[PDB]
Amino acid sequence: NGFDPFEWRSFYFPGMSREEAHKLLGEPQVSIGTFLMRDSSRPGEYSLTVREADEGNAVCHYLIERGEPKEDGTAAAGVKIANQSFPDIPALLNHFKMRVLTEASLLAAYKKPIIEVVVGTFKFTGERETDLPFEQGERLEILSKTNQDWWEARNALGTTGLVPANYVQIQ
């Protein structure tokens, strides 16, 4: 369909708050069915945020709770939204392509607009887990000019992270 449930980490926004998600997904040009994942205010949980209507209640949030892992260590903990259990997060996301959460189904992953297109001028291995490693000559899309030194970038795969401004050049 409109997204690959197995690649959900590419529509996951670790830095984003509930309030920022609500604002972004609530913007007038955002189509119903647009969604993203992010961290919950609850430790070790995820939140799914979805534009489900035009006239409020426009934007809804769902706690994705992790269940109890089997004691053998040979079956990862399942996952739950409300009182529906799923073997994993991709299974959960797939399920809501064709079934509604509250008012709408998941149609398309939210994507930030491109500020500019750049290419890597040097190789970048990354320094922190928040960074986006890239190759020299690699094409990236800049999503945010955070500060003068570090910019939020997105690679061809859809993976997002910070990159040094002095390592990229307008394409």
Side-chain angles (χ1 to χ4, degrees), residues 3-81:
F3 62 92
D4 180 356
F6 294 101
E7 296 306 318
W8 66 263
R9 288 172 176 83
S10 303
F11 44 79
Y12 166 57
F13 296 83
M16 196 183 284
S17 66
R18 184 184 174 111
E19 290 70 39
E20 190 182 3
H22 206 295
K23 181 201 172 168
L24 295 181
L25 281 170
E27 293 186 338
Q29 79 290 347
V30 174
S31 55
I32 291 168
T34 312
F35 70 95
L36 56 79
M37 279 180 67
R38 59 182 174 79
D39 299 310
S40 174
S41 64
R42 273 109 113 68
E45 311 295 33
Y46 291 119
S47 278
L48 176 66
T49 305
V50 198
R51 175 63 168 272
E52 293 194 57
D54 279 341
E55 327 166 9
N57 178 16
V59 178
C60 313
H61 304 83
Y62 302 89
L63 203 208
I64 298 180
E65 311 179 64
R66 176 160 59 159
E68 168 174 292
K70 281 205 77 61
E71 327 192 339
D72 41 63
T74 66
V79 129
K80 194 174 62 177
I81 281 196

Side-chain angles (χ1 to χ4, degrees), residues 132-151:
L132 176 65
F134 57 90
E135 294 173 43
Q136 178 176 62
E138 184 174 346
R139 180 191 184 281
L140 304 169
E141 285 164 1
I142 302 300
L143 281 13
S144 187
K145 290 183 174 187
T146 330
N147 53 65
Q148 52 199 159
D149 290 326
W150 293 86
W151 298 346

Side-chain angles (χ1 to χ4, degrees), residues 124-133 150 162:
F124 181 57
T125 67
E127 305 176 343
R128 305 169 183 185
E129 56 302 301
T130 60
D131 298 343
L132 176 65
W150 293 86
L162 293 175

Side-chain angles (χ1 to χ4, degrees), residues 1 48 50 52 84 86 92-107:
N1 308 47
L48 176 66
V50 198
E52 293 194 57
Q84 301 175 62
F86 299 94
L92 178 157
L93 295 176
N94 179 74
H95 177 86
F96 288 105
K97 282 190 176 182
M98 290 301 281
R99 224 80 290 242
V100 297
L101 292 146
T102 286
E103 294 295 332
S105 284
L106 304 184
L107 200 163

Side-chain angles (χ1 to χ4, degrees), residues 110-131:
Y110 180 76
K111 298 190 70 188
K112 302 182 184 188
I114 303 160
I115 290 165
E116 59 181 27
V117 182
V118 298
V119 304
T121 57
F122 304 94
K123 102 173 154 183
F124 181 57
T125 67
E127 305 176 343
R128 305 169 183 185
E129 56 302 301
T130 60
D131 298 343

